[model samples]
Target: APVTELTRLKEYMEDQIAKAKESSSLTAQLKFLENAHTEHFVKMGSLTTIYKGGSEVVDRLKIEIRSLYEEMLELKDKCRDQIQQY
Candidate 1:
């Protein structure tokens, strides 16, 4: 009976050790997930900045194009007037 008791005590200690190892491994995984989340947010911030800059460039191009179109219309009118005079 004493031998059986000692054997049960060893098994219980082994079980506790295994549980401790598993808990520590899970904690490490949780830390890794947190780091990944932070990195993702940083990447998103840079992307947003790039998108904003790109939109500003597009807006400037649109303004320039409108001005060019107006100039072309003025030139077309002048050409038409010259032809009529001829």
Candidate 2:
């Protein structure tokens, strides 16, 4: 009976050691995930800034195009008036 008890105790200790190793590995994965989460958000913020800058340039281009169109119309009207006099 004493020998059997020793065998059971050894098995229990082995099982506990396995669980400890598994828990430590899970902790490492959790730490890696935390860093990955932070990096993902930081990259997202950078992308948002880039998009905002791009949108501002687009708006400026639109304004310039509208002004050029107005100038073209004025030139067209002046040419029409000169033609009528001739």
Candidate 3:
């Protein structure tokens, strides 16, 4: 089956979350989605509302994922950089 627009966004966010888990300097944010309701495809071993972080602070535990997307912009100012970075 094809990914729906909403699922597309979910998958994108999932990737961000995965990245954030690996870095310590990234911004922090809390996010959520309807677990038993929304039509998401894959599954996260841990869900936000479940407080997987285990302090009723799952939201607080989240973070704004960092992106290296702009580092290239500061490089050579190449239009091709924009297309190739991501």
**Any residue pairs clashing in model 2, and if so which?**
none
**What TM-score, to 2 decimals, does candidate 2 have?**
0.34
The CA lDDT at 20 in model 3 is 38
**Weakest lDDT window of 10 consecutive positions for candidate 3:** 28-37
Q: Write the per-residue lDDT of candidate 1 for residues 1-86, one digit (tens) a residue.
A: 32333233334433433343344344443333333334334543444454444355444543443443344345435544554666
Clashing pairs in 3: 27-64, 28-63, 29-62, 29-63
- Candidate 2: list runs displaced more than 4 Å: 1-54
Residue-level error in angstroms, candidate 3, position 62: 19
Q: Which regions in candidate 3 have their CA more than 4 angstroms from the true location? A: 1-3, 27-86
TM-score, predicted candidate 3 vs. hidden true structure? 0.26
The lDDT of model 2 is 0.41
Flag the better candidate by TM-score, 2 or 3. Answer: 2
Q: Choose 1 or 3, whichever is better by TM-score.
A: 1
Q: How would you encode candidate 3's per-residue C-alpha lDDT over 1-86 as one tens digit per residue? A: 12233244354655544453443432221122122112232322234333344333233323211122222123223323433564
